[model samples]
Target chain A: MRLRVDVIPGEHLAYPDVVLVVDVIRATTTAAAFLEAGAEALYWTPSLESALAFKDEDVVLAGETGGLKPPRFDLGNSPREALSAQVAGRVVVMSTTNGTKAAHAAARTAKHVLLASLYNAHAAARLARELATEEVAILCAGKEGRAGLDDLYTAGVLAEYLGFLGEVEPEDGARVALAVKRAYPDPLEALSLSAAALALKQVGLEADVPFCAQVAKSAAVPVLRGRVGEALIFKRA
Target chain B: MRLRVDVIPGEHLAYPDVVLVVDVIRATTTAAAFLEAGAEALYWTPSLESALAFKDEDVVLAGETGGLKPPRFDLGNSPREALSAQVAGRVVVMSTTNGTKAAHAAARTAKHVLLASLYNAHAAARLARELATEEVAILCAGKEGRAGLDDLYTAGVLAEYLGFLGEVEPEDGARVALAVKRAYPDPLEALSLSAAALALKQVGLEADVPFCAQVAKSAAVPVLRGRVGEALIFKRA
Candidate 1:
């Protein structure tokens, strides 16, 4: 079995094998937290247009564009807000610029699709290995529709963990896994290489930085076992 | 003013200001040699129908799928074959599964689109710095319609070259640049990671392997300065 990481911006991700879609800061992380907070399921969309298109009363409209909540949304997918009492027990429909689009793409093609973050890297890697066949694909949800460094870093970590349990090749999954292993130690040291991190810093999104950087903090690999139209259900990977 | 390198497959290569397309193994490299060998210019077609639609004698049907030249072409874009005498001094129109498509994407939004390779890294970087306004993007033509390590390696080299030219904020381009710099000492060392390399090795393409690994042997930087319908003109970048 082998693993490969591909980075093509704006191109729809099409995978024949199982795919784990990752967005550590902060979409997938928030989704995992929200699900853990008692949300029955989460609905993912790429844009506000798509999110409002459904207009389901039962589904809470949750999304973010540039870290802050869109004024129209019932809630934004913030990990901190997700822990609050009001949204702690509701079924939320969530969307973000990067993560939701990534989820949509994976759900469209992957035999098995999972939403992952540092929150559940180990658990997700373990579960994905359990369900994987000959090959497994990891999609890193990059910021602003570009190749994201941090997410790719996390994907590499998961790929490395998967390698320990399976017959894996270094060129495909192993290179990325090694890359993550090497670059992940000094998150602050490598901050200059991350566009999203710098952008967050400029926008005063300082607190969310370290919050999103904690690796494998959670154990939930939110899987898209099914879909309602374009909305994917975040179940257990 | 800075360079960024991304090494993941399936990561998008769209940057608004400046973009250079790199396909070292062996599409753009072959394309550059094809033009240098005395071919008037090359036309890139994305689809078979478009390639076949050309009735002009000047048009040379060419491409590769799964690393082998398809039956429908007058020639296939191969670095070895590109240096052939018969192809020299002819008006050659060409197409390939990966390089042509990547060229189209890079040319669509980038202010300047140039081709980069280990064969022509310095020239491409110099030209890129000269032409780059606010940002410069590099696109890699990878195998099987995905990101190949060779292309990313070449991008890193170009990024490093641009960095030495006193371009600041070289952080974005540093990672890939560092990777390419590291890979430069032994290009074939990274080849084992590619599916195409494995297939080629199985089929006895070992001789051509070292030839593709040679760095800075050719200094031509092919540029898509114009278009013939949807096809691009692969000339000196």
Candidate 2:
């Protein structure tokens, strides 16, 4: 399979069979936590109004704007907060600054979408390889519109995992990702030094940094099945 | 000094005191060749009509659109062609697909603008360090808005050079560049494997690949001075 990596959401034009979106600092990491904590499914929405619209007796609202929980939201964009017992047996509808934008953009092009992070990178890579598609696009949800080291490093980790799965020819971006991952082999150390991690630390959510840095903690690969009304719901692939 | 690196021309929002634009495959490398061949000055224009408008007895035109010379142009964006003896003691009006756009973008924001490539990385970095600007932005003229490994690796080489000159706190993009540079220690090897270089080879301009890959071959720093009428002229810094 041909593996391609792009930093920003719209940087690449190649349409792959599946697009794996990564936001290692919090969004995808929180998604994995929601699933690991026993959430029935997770919905990704970029609009706050849509997230609030999805709220119901069974669905819990979660999201963050500028790293803080929005007013009346159930949880911030923090993996530690996502791991709470309250997440069990519930549906999580999340809206974040970066992750949902990337997911929404990819949803328009990719046939299948998967949320990936250090927490469930291996699981996602394994599932992606099993699909045996001709191409796989790893889209890194960078901070704002620029490239973020945290997402690039996580992309590299996924690229490395896919490297062992089968014969893969990586594009220039995937090669750069692998090189960046080698520069900081330890995933936690890499995430700790990222700008997003420092920004999260400044907002008194420092606990989320370590929680999201844990690698291969879960085997759940969150795949976007389809939209539930206005929200895009993701279930384990 | 704060060292910031941008993967594409418009990636960063911060206005830099000085901007060094790197187009390693051909544009900046060709500019360096023009100076090294004894050209009096090189003019960079984003428009072919502008380049044609500046033609005179002492001025020669150069440019490329899609890795090939434009119709009725004097040169074909090749470093080897740039080194012709006829290029000596003449003004070169140049236009390219990517480099000129980046230079134009930086000219609008930066107090000082310089063109850079593998051929003159050390020279550009040394001059930048001497300026001691509070912020220095390294703008990579990526291939059509996406990050190009050739330009990114050249930026990393400049980052390494600046690191030796003083305390340089590189941003995430710079760090990624450094990592890619480390992965391919030999600049030529890195360039040879780049998509642009491969494309050049396919067009039978393989000689330009190795010539552009040579690092620090020239001390000439092509600084963008004020526009001469409608053309942007670059003289040695």
Candidate 3:
């Protein structure tokens, strides 16, 4: 398979058969947790107003901006919060600083889109392998326009796992990620070095750090289906 | 010091005081060899037609396209070819598929620009350290708008050495490069894994692969002087 990786929230011109959208801290992680917690699906909204606008009886709002819960949102962008009964058996409409935008960007061009994080890296890779596509692009949701180490390290983990399945002709970014995964064998230690994880720690959300660092803890692979009004819906695939 | 790395021919919105433009698999390597072989100065041209027009008494034309030397040019984009006695005491006008374009792009905004390769990475980083600029951008000349592993690996070596001098806040790309450098202790083995190096080997330019892999062999840092009629002039800094 021809594998490629790029820092999303940046330039990525590759039109791949399948795109694994990664936002390790903490959108994808939380989405995976919600799916594992029995949430039917997720609607990824790019704006806070639209996320709150999903006021259906069974819809729950979850998201964060600058690592804090927005006013009146039912849940903050925390994977631990996603595991609770409050979100179980419900549909989560989520928005975040970077993850949703990245997902939307990938969804615009990709044939299939899968949400990935440390929580579901192995599952995501396995799903991509099962699809047996010619090209797989790992899209990392970096903080704003700058590449965040958190997302890149997580992408590295995914790339490393995918390398075992077949003939992987990795581009430069994939090679770099695989090398990083080799250097930092301890996933938590590698995540701790990321700017986003450190920022989460500085803002008193240290609990989320290790929670997101748990590799393959969740088996859910959220795939983007289509958009409903302003929200992009993701179902378990 | 804050450091940033970009695959030029890619997104690099941050403008730094000085930019170190790198082309590991030939142009910068050839330039370093030219400086080491006693050439007085080198001229960088982005277009092949312009490079060939520098037919003055003391000028020698050199460059390549798709790994092959253009007909009627004095030399190809090879470091070993650049080390010839014919280049000594003469001004070499050069162009390449990627490196010259990257250099010209940096020269438009950066206050100072230096040519860097595996052969002169140490010298270039040392020069930047001496400048003591608050920001340094390592611009890699990737092949055709995609990050080449060869340039990124060389960039990693430069980033690793620069980290020793002071505190460095590296972004995602820089962190990846440093990790790759750490993973492969042997420079040649690391370079052999790069797609660009492999392409060179396939094109019967196998001799150039190991030659460009030699790290920190040149003490000269080729700094961009002012342009002379669309030609960027470089002198030892």
CAPRI tier for the interface of model 1? acceptable
Ranking by TM-score: 2, 3, 1
Candidate 1, superposed: residue stretches over 4 Å from native: A8-13, A36-38, A45-61, A84-89, A170-177, A188-192, A226-230, B2-18, B35-40, B43-62, B70-74, B143-145, B170-185, B199-206, B225-231
Score each candidate by Cα lDDT. 0.67, 0.84, 0.83
Off by over 4 Å in 2: A228-230, B55-58, B228-230
Worst 10 residues of 2 chain A by lDDT: A7-16
Clashes of each: 26, 0, 0
**Each predicted model: what fraction of the native A–B Cα contacts (within 8 Å) does it retain?**
0.20, 0.46, 0.44
User: Alpha-carbon error at B234 in model 2, in Å?
Assistant: 1.5
lDDT tens digits, residues A103-190, model 2?
Answer: 8888887888899998998999998888757888898888765678889999999999999888888777888888899999777777
Per-candidate chain B TM: 0.85, 0.95, 0.95
lDDT of 3 at B48: 91
lDDT of 1: 0.67
**lDDT of model 3 at residue B116?**
93
Specify the highest-lDDT model's number: 2
